[PDB]
């Protein structure tokens, strides 16, 4: 399978709005978990949301959410009530749940608030 697509490459959105990304796959794997990543100024990576959702998993904020589109290949990484703090670079990635796990991550898309 091919790496996913994180669009749009640049999303400029006014403060306190609904900013929504799109993580699209050409072909899906049988078992996989999709992750939403954000790069911190410390050159770190933070996992904000994950599909499928695990309500018991700590650290998840109610603002950032991932939504599976009806076609099952495309996803919606939306944030509600966007803050100027949210300005940064984002990316999506999938990890297969097969024995030999393969990492397939998108390119980076910047968010501006």
């Amino acid at each position: 399978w091919n790496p996913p697509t994180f669009s749009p490459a640049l999303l400029v959105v006014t403060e306190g709005d609904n900013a929504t990304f799109t993580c699209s796959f050409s072909n899906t794997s049988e078992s996989f978990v999709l992750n939403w990543y954000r790069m911190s100024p410390s050159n770190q990576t933070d996992k904000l949301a994950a599909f499928p959702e695990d309500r018991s998993q700590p650290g998840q904020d109610c603002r950032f959410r991932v939504t599976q589109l009806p076609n099952g290949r495309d996803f919606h990484m939306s944030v509600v009530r966007a803050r100027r703090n949210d300005s940064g670079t984002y990316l999506c990635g999938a990890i297969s749940l097969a024995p030999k796990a393969q990492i397939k991550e998108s390119l980076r898309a910047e968010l501006r608030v």
Epitope: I95, L97, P99, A101
Partner: antibody
Framework: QVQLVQSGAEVKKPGASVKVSCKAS????????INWVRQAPGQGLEWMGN????????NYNEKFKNRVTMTRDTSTSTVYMELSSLRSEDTAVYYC??????????WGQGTLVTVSS | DIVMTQSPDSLAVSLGERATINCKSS????????????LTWYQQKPGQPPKLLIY???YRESGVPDRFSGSGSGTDFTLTISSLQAEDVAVYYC?????????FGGGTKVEIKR
């Protein structure tokens, strides 16, 4: 919630063998790697092995050449760890953990195995 | 076999300053198939199961605070706490997550200097 409950503490004699259970719940049990890590009193952690419940693939540590044995039971969603030819040095708390790379890490509460005459 | 050496063995930092722990591996932990450095950092308080802090050298697990930050590439790696709080006193282990066996480092005790 995701939970890993391990079997209770056990005391064994030198030369015996212990079998520690680890019951997974709250996720697709057969799809995630389950690790075994032990910690002797006053010493760091030591990786012991891997098991993939989907096909019972195992990755043992070379330190326990033929002493360690990992198995699974899909009907009860439990993984078992067996260590034979026990020594006093094998006295430790043994942990099971769901550690599939890139996914969230969960841990059992631990199991104390005392090896002493 | 991968050998993980952690230096210093023990570290004393005042409350609120920066702590740095080093971890050197005998072989490279780089994976060309995933473009990642497979190194994990763990935190363990006495009487508690270990807690995963950083995976893939510089990826933060959900719930890990801001102060924890991983870095390095190849055979040299580093875990840094920018603002050492009281709740950070624990032993920190680096672990080879790349090739089998997934050997641990000796650990580094982090205590509050007073």
């Amino acid at each position: 919630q995701v939970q890993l409950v391990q079997s209770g503490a056990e005391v064994k004699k030198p030369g015996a063998s212990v079998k520690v259970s680890c019951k997974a719940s709250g996720y697709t049990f057969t799809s995630y790697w389950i690790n075994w890590v032990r910690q002797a009193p006053g010493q760091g952690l030591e990786w012991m092995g891997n098991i993939y419940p989907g096909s019972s693939l195992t990755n043992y540590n070379e330190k326990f050449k033929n002493r360690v044995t990992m198995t699974r039971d899909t009907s009860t969603s439990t993984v078992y760890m067996e260590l034979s030819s026990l020594r006093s040095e094998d006295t430790a708390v043994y942990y099971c953990a769901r550690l599939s790379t890139g996914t969230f890490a969960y841990w059992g509460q631990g199991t104390l195995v005392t090896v002493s005459s | 076999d991968i050998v993980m050496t952690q230096s210093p063995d023990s570290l004393a930092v005042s409350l609120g300053e920066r702590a740095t722990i080093n971890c050197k591996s005998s072989q490279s932990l780089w994976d060309s198939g995933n473009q990642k450095n497979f190194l994990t950092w763990y935190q363990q308080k006495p009487g508690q199961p270990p807690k995963l802090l950083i995976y893939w050298t510089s990826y933060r697990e959900s719930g890990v605070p801001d102060r924890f930050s991983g870095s390095g590439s190849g055979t040299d790696f580093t875990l840094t706490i920018s603002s050492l709080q009281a709740e950070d006193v624990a032993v920190y282990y680096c672990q080879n997550d790349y090739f089998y066996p997934h050997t641990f480092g000796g650990g580094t005790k982090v205590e509050i200097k007073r």
